[PDB]
PDB file of all heavy atoms in Angstrom:
ATOM      1  N   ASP A  69      -4.352   6.628   2.156  1.00 39.10           N
ATOM      2  CA  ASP A  69      -4.547   7.830   1.563  1.00 39.10           C
ATOM      3  C   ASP A  69      -4.102   7.741   0.037  1.00 39.10           C
ATOM      4  O   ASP A  69      -3.429   6.843  -0.320  1.00 39.10           O
ATOM      5  CB  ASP A  69      -3.894   9.009   2.218  1.00 39.10           C
ATOM      6  CG  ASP A  69      -4.390  10.365   1.922  1.00 39.10           C
ATOM      7  OD1 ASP A  69      -5.343  10.484   1.073  1.00 39.10           O
ATOM      8  OD2 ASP A  69      -3.858  11.378   2.491  1.00 39.10           O
ATOM      9  N   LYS A  70      -4.443   8.750  -0.737  1.00 39.14           N
ATOM     10  CA  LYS A  70      -3.800   8.930  -1.980  1.00 39.14           C
ATOM     11  C   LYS A  70      -2.381   9.331  -1.924  1.00 39.14           C
ATOM     12  O   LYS A  70      -1.650   9.366  -2.948  1.00 39.14           O
ATOM     13  CB  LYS A  70      -4.588   9.852  -2.873  1.00 39.14           C
ATOM     14  CG  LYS A  70      -4.503  11.347  -2.413  1.00 39.14           C
ATOM     15  CD  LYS A  70      -5.190  12.246  -3.447  1.00 39.14           C
ATOM     16  CE  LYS A  70      -5.035  13.684  -2.927  1.00 39.14           C
ATOM     17  NZ  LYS A  70      -3.642  14.214  -2.922  1.00 39.14           N
ATOM     18  N   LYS A  71      -1.944   9.812  -0.707  1.00 41.16           N
ATOM     19  CA  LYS A  71      -0.544  10.029  -0.500  1.00 41.16           C
ATOM     20  C   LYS A  71       0.158   8.671  -0.176  1.00 41.16           C
ATOM     21  O   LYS A  71       1.213   8.365  -0.652  1.00 41.16           O
ATOM     22  CB  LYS A  71      -0.370  10.992   0.653  1.00 41.16           C
ATOM     23  CG  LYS A  71      -0.776  12.464   0.292  1.00 41.16           C
ATOM     24  CD  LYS A  71      -0.498  13.371   1.487  1.00 41.16           C
ATOM     25  CE  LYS A  71      -0.918  14.841   1.134  1.00 41.16           C
ATOM     26  NZ  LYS A  71      -0.713  15.739   2.249  1.00 41.16           N
ATOM     27  N   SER A  72      -0.553   7.816   0.704  1.00 41.23           N
ATOM     28  CA  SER A  72       0.057   6.597   1.141  1.00 41.23           C
ATOM     29  C   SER A  72      -0.314   5.423   0.205  1.00 41.23           C
ATOM     30  O   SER A  72      -0.100   4.304   0.582  1.00 41.23           O
ATOM     31  CB  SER A  72      -0.399   6.389   2.617  1.00 41.23           C
ATOM     32  OG  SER A  72      -1.826   6.219   2.633  1.00 41.23           O
ATOM     33  N   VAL A  73      -0.834   5.701  -0.986  1.00 41.36           N
ATOM     34  CA  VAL A  73      -1.059   4.650  -1.906  1.00 41.36           C
ATOM     35  C   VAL A  73       0.285   4.124  -2.492  1.00 41.36           C
ATOM     36  O   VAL A  73       0.525   2.959  -2.688  1.00 41.36           O
ATOM     37  CB  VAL A  73      -2.041   5.085  -3.098  1.00 41.36           C
ATOM     38  CG1 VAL A  73      -1.478   6.210  -3.845  1.00 41.36           C
ATOM     39  CG2 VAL A  73      -2.204   3.865  -4.048  1.00 41.36           C
ATOM     40  N   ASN A  74       1.309   4.994  -2.623  1.00 41.98           N
ATOM     41  CA  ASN A  74       2.568   4.766  -3.132  1.00 41.98           C
ATOM     42  C   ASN A  74       3.584   4.365  -2.022  1.00 41.98           C
ATOM     43  O   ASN A  74       4.746   4.001  -2.376  1.00 41.98           O
ATOM     44  CB  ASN A  74       3.044   5.876  -4.040  1.00 41.98           C
ATOM     45  CG  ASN A  74       2.279   5.942  -5.252  1.00 41.98           C
ATOM     46  OD1 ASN A  74       1.903   4.986  -5.897  1.00 41.98           O
ATOM     47  ND2 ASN A  74       1.908   7.216  -5.505  1.00 41.98           N
ATOM     48  N   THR A  75       3.109   4.494  -0.777  1.00 39.20           N
ATOM     49  CA  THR A  75       3.907   3.945   0.347  1.00 39.20           C
ATOM     50  C   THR A  75       3.649   2.399   0.490  1.00 39.20           C
ATOM     51  O   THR A  75       4.524   1.653   0.699  1.00 39.20           O
ATOM     52  CB  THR A  75       3.597   4.729   1.595  1.00 39.20           C
ATOM     53  OG1 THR A  75       4.020   6.102   1.432  1.00 39.20           O
ATOM     54  CG2 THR A  75       4.418   4.216   2.828  1.00 39.20           C
ATOM     55  N   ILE A  76       2.335   2.100   0.442  1.00 38.99           N
ATOM     56  CA  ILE A  76       1.955   0.702   0.676  1.00 38.99           C
ATOM     57  C   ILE A  76       2.419  -0.162  -0.492  1.00 38.99           C
ATOM     58  O   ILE A  76       2.939  -1.216  -0.410  1.00 38.99           O
ATOM     59  CB  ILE A  76       0.445   0.623   0.964  1.00 38.99           C
ATOM     60  CG1 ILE A  76       0.084   1.400   2.270  1.00 38.99           C
ATOM     61  CG2 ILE A  76      -0.021  -0.843   1.076  1.00 38.99           C
ATOM     62  CD1 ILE A  76       0.822   1.007   3.460  1.00 38.99           C
ATOM     63  N   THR A  77       2.038   0.284  -1.743  1.00 37.15           N
ATOM     64  CA  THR A  77       2.400  -0.476  -2.914  1.00 37.15           C
ATOM     65  C   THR A  77       3.850  -0.603  -3.183  1.00 37.15           C
ATOM     66  O   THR A  77       4.357  -1.565  -3.877  1.00 37.15           O
ATOM     67  CB  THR A  77       1.634   0.093  -4.150  1.00 37.15           C
ATOM     68  OG1 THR A  77       2.031   1.460  -4.314  1.00 37.15           O
ATOM     69  CG2 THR A  77       0.164   0.008  -4.006  1.00 37.15           C
ATOM     70  N   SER A  78       4.708   0.289  -2.659  1.00 38.42           N
ATOM     71  CA  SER A  78       6.118   0.161  -2.779  1.00 38.42           C
ATOM     72  C   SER A  78       6.668  -0.815  -1.813  1.00 38.42           C
ATOM     73  O   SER A  78       7.467  -1.721  -2.114  1.00 38.42           O
ATOM     74  CB  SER A  78       6.737   1.516  -2.648  1.00 38.42           C
ATOM     75  OG  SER A  78       8.199   1.370  -2.786  1.00 38.42           O
ATOM     76  N   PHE A  79       6.377  -0.682  -0.530  1.00 35.78           N
ATOM     77  CA  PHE A  79       7.056  -1.496   0.552  1.00 35.78           C
ATOM     78  C   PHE A  79       6.443  -2.915   0.628  1.00 35.78           C
ATOM     79  O   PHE A  79       7.222  -3.813   0.717  1.00 35.78           O
ATOM     80  CB  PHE A  79       6.945  -0.749   1.904  1.00 35.78           C
ATOM     81  CG  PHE A  79       7.853   0.399   2.077  1.00 35.78           C
ATOM     82  CD1 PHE A  79       7.377   1.683   1.937  1.00 35.78           C
ATOM     83  CD2 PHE A  79       9.242   0.249   2.289  1.00 35.78           C
ATOM     84  CE1 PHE A  79       8.332   2.752   2.050  1.00 35.78           C
ATOM     85  CE2 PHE A  79      10.061   1.303   2.446  1.00 35.78           C
ATOM     86  CZ  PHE A  79       9.574   2.529   2.265  1.00 35.78           C
ATOM     87  N   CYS A  80       5.121  -2.995   0.565  1.00 34.32           N
ATOM     88  CA  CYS A  80       4.563  -4.332   0.671  1.00 34.32           C
ATOM     89  C   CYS A  80       4.816  -5.212  -0.468  1.00 34.32           C
ATOM     90  O   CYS A  80       5.054  -6.452  -0.330  1.00 34.32           O
ATOM     91  CB  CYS A  80       3.037  -4.245   0.896  1.00 34.32           C
ATOM     92  SG  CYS A  80       2.565  -3.470   2.460  1.00 34.32           S
ATOM     93  N   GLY A  81       4.855  -4.660  -1.672  1.00 37.40           N
ATOM     94  CA  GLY A  81       5.335  -5.371  -2.853  1.00 37.40           C
ATOM     95  C   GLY A  81       6.799  -5.850  -2.785  1.00 37.40           C
ATOM     96  O   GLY A  81       7.209  -6.827  -3.323  1.00 37.40           O
ATOM     97  N   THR A  82       7.637  -5.011  -2.132  1.00 36.85           N
ATOM     98  CA  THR A  82       9.029  -5.323  -1.910  1.00 36.85           C
ATOM     99  C   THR A  82       9.244  -6.189  -0.670  1.00 36.85           C
ATOM    100  O   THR A  82       9.889  -7.224  -0.834  1.00 36.85           O
ATOM    101  CB  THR A  82       9.857  -4.051  -1.717  1.00 36.85           C
ATOM    102  OG1 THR A  82       9.708  -3.186  -2.900  1.00 36.85           O
ATOM    103  CG2 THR A  82      11.312  -4.350  -1.551  1.00 36.85           C
ATOM    104  N   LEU A  83       8.640  -5.842   0.501  1.00 36.28           N
ATOM    105  CA  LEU A  83       8.986  -6.565   1.661  1.00 36.28           C
ATOM    106  C   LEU A  83       8.069  -7.773   1.860  1.00 36.28           C
ATOM    107  O   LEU A  83       8.233  -8.395   2.998  1.00 36.28           O
ATOM    108  CB  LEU A  83       8.838  -5.596   2.935  1.00 36.28           C
ATOM    109  CG  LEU A  83       9.823  -4.482   2.910  1.00 36.28           C
ATOM    110  CD1 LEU A  83       9.612  -3.608   4.121  1.00 36.28           C
ATOM    111  CD2 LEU A  83      11.232  -5.051   2.946  1.00 36.28           C
ATOM    112  N   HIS A  84       7.320  -8.204   0.810  1.00 36.90           N
ATOM    113  CA  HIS A  84       6.727  -9.568   0.766  1.00 36.90           C
ATOM    114  C   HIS A  84       5.714  -9.748   1.836  1.00 36.90           C
ATOM    115  O   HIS A  84       5.560 -10.908   2.308  1.00 36.90           O
ATOM    116  CB  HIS A  84       7.724 -10.618   0.595  1.00 36.90           C
ATOM    117  CG  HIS A  84       8.449 -10.678  -0.689  1.00 36.90           C
ATOM    118  ND1 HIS A  84       9.552  -9.825  -0.924  1.00 36.90           N
ATOM    119  CD2 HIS A  84       8.270 -11.406  -1.796  1.00 36.90           C
ATOM    120  CE1 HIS A  84       9.964 -10.109  -2.159  1.00 36.90           C
ATOM    121  NE2 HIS A  84       9.189 -11.021  -2.757  1.00 36.90           N
ATOM    122  N   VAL A  85       5.066  -8.755   2.313  1.00 36.84           N
ATOM    123  CA  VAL A  85       4.001  -8.864   3.322  1.00 36.84           C
ATOM    124  C   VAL A  85       2.728  -8.355   2.705  1.00 36.84           C
ATOM    125  O   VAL A  85       2.641  -7.209   2.186  1.00 36.84           O
ATOM    126  CB  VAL A  85       4.294  -8.036   4.627  1.00 36.84           C
ATOM    127  CG1 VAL A  85       3.194  -8.146   5.635  1.00 36.84           C
ATOM    128  CG2 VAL A  85       5.660  -8.637   5.181  1.00 36.84           C
ATOM    129  N   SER A  86       1.712  -9.226   2.829  1.00 38.78           N
ATOM    130  CA  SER A  86       0.389  -8.857   2.094  1.00 38.78           C
ATOM    131  C   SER A  86      -0.325  -7.875   2.960  1.00 38.78           C
ATOM    132  O   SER A  86      -0.257  -7.829   4.183  1.00 38.78           O
ATOM    133  CB  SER A  86      -0.422 -10.178   1.972  1.00 38.78           C
ATOM    134  OG  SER A  86       0.115 -11.037   1.119  1.00 38.78           O
ATOM    135  N   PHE A  87      -1.037  -6.893   2.277  1.00 40.77           N
ATOM    136  CA  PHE A  87      -1.797  -5.908   2.842  1.00 40.77           C
ATOM    137  C   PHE A  87      -3.302  -5.984   2.430  1.00 40.77           C
ATOM    138  O   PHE A  87      -3.576  -6.203   1.294  1.00 40.77           O
ATOM    139  CB  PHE A  87      -1.200  -4.503   2.562  1.00 40.77           C
ATOM    140  CG  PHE A  87      -1.927  -3.319   3.251  1.00 40.77           C
ATOM    141  CD1 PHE A  87      -1.675  -3.136   4.564  1.00 40.77           C
ATOM    142  CD2 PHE A  87      -2.830  -2.546   2.505  1.00 40.77           C
ATOM    143  CE1 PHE A  87      -2.276  -2.057   5.243  1.00 40.77           C
ATOM    144  CE2 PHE A  87      -3.400  -1.511   3.213  1.00 40.77           C
ATOM    145  CZ  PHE A  87      -3.156  -1.255   4.576  1.00 40.77           C
ATOM    146  N   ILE A  88      -4.148  -5.756   3.427  1.00 41.09           N
ATOM    147  CA  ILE A  88      -5.652  -5.845   3.199  1.00 41.09           C
ATOM    148  C   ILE A  88      -6.287  -4.596   3.519  1.00 41.09           C
ATOM    149  O   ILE A  88      -5.967  -3.954   4.493  1.00 41.09           O
ATOM    150  CB  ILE A  88      -6.201  -7.049   3.972  1.00 41.09           C
ATOM    151  CG1 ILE A  88      -5.675  -8.421   3.504  1.00 41.09           C
ATOM    152  CG2 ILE A  88      -7.823  -7.044   3.826  1.00 41.09           C
ATOM    153  CD1 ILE A  88      -4.544  -8.942   4.433  1.00 41.09           C
ATOM    154  N   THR A  89      -7.167  -4.097   2.680  1.00 40.21           N
ATOM    155  CA  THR A  89      -7.721  -2.731   2.830  1.00 40.21           C
ATOM    156  C   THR A  89      -9.153  -2.726   2.195  1.00 40.21           C
ATOM    157  O   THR A  89      -9.476  -3.446   1.304  1.00 40.21           O
ATOM    158  CB  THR A  89      -6.858  -1.684   2.208  1.00 40.21           C
ATOM    159  OG1 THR A  89      -7.454  -0.383   2.466  1.00 40.21           O
ATOM    160  CG2 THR A  89      -6.682  -1.852   0.724  1.00 40.21           C
ATOM    161  N   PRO A  90     -10.026  -1.906   2.822  1.00 39.91           N
ATOM    162  CA  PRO A  90     -11.212  -1.522   2.089  1.00 39.91           C
ATOM    163  C   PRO A  90     -11.114  -0.249   1.229  1.00 39.91           C
ATOM    164  O   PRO A  90     -12.139   0.182   0.669  1.00 39.91           O
ATOM    165  CB  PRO A  90     -12.224  -1.304   3.261  1.00 39.91           C
ATOM    166  CG  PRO A  90     -11.644  -1.974   4.357  1.00 39.91           C
ATOM    167  CD  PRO A  90     -10.222  -1.783   4.336  1.00 39.91           C
ATOM    168  N   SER A  91      -9.883   0.272   1.036  1.00 39.51           N
ATOM    169  CA  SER A  91      -9.744   1.464   0.331  1.00 39.51           C
ATOM    170  C   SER A  91      -9.900   1.281  -1.230  1.00 39.51           C
ATOM    171  O   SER A  91     -10.007   0.085  -1.648  1.00 39.51           O
ATOM    172  CB  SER A  91      -8.387   2.148   0.608  1.00 39.51           C
ATOM    173  OG  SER A  91      -8.391   2.555   1.900  1.00 39.51           O
ATOM    174  N   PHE A  92      -9.756   2.335  -1.903  1.00 41.79           N
ATOM    175  CA  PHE A  92      -9.954   2.274  -3.463  1.00 41.79           C
ATOM    176  C   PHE A  92      -8.844   1.464  -4.058  1.00 41.79           C
ATOM    177  O   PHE A  92      -7.717   1.508  -3.586  1.00 41.79           O
ATOM    178  CB  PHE A  92     -10.079   3.753  -3.994  1.00 41.79           C
ATOM    179  CG  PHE A  92      -8.830   4.505  -3.852  1.00 41.79           C
ATOM    180  CD1 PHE A  92      -7.889   4.628  -4.777  1.00 41.79           C
ATOM    181  CD2 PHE A  92      -8.740   5.261  -2.703  1.00 41.79           C
ATOM    182  CE1 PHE A  92      -6.741   5.367  -4.627  1.00 41.79           C
ATOM    183  CE2 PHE A  92      -7.558   6.093  -2.479  1.00 41.79           C
ATOM    184  CZ  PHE A  92      -6.585   6.102  -3.418  1.00 41.79           C
ATOM    185  N   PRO A  93      -9.131   0.745  -5.244  1.00 42.56           N
ATOM    186  CA  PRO A  93      -8.084  -0.046  -5.866  1.00 42.56           C
ATOM    187  C   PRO A  93      -6.969   0.721  -6.488  1.00 42.56           C
ATOM    188  O   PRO A  93      -7.111   1.977  -6.872  1.00 42.56           O
ATOM    189  CB  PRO A  93      -8.801  -0.923  -6.860  1.00 42.56           C
ATOM    190  CG  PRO A  93     -10.234  -0.819  -6.475  1.00 42.56           C
ATOM    191  CD  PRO A  93     -10.441   0.524  -5.829  1.00 42.56           C
TER     192      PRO A  93
END
């Protein structure tokens, strides 16, 4: 979501686990 855009970009960039999505960049 546009709510969870800053949940994924915060934790995955920190916890060093790559995330794959068809969502908007």
